[PDB]
């Protein structure tokens, strides 16, 4: 029965919690980082052209 409770808790919390949190965080951070990288590339190109 103790082992059963181990299984119950591990199934309930870890899988779904990690899925939701990791998916949302990774997607948002990846989109923001891609946009920031594009903006930095544009700014570096502008500075190089001015130079």
């Amino acid at each position: 029965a103790a082992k059963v409770k181990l299984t119950l808790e591990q199934a309930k919390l870890p899988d779904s919690q990690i899925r939701s949190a990791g998916f949302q965080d990774l997607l948002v951070q990846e989109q923001t980082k891609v946009q920031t990288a594009q903006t930095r590339r544009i700014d570096q190109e502008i500075l190089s052209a001015g130079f």
Binding site: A1, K3, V4, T7
Partner: protein
């Protein structure tokens, strides 16, 4: 004379160990009692174990 001799010889060889055999059998009876009790515990244990899977 000779028939009595033969019967006595038959008697002495088998006499002693028969009681020992009987006592061994009844000890095995008690042992089977305890095995049955353990299996009675076994069925309930497994039934409670059912849902872990």
């Amino acid at each position: 004379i000779t028939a009595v001799l033969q019967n006595a010889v038959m008697f002495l060889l088998q006499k002693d160990e028969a009681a020992n055999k009987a006592a061994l059998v009844e000890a095995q009876i008690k042992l089977t009692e305890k095995q049955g009790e353990l299996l009675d515990k076994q069925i309930a244990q497994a039934d409670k174990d059912a849902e872990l899977i």
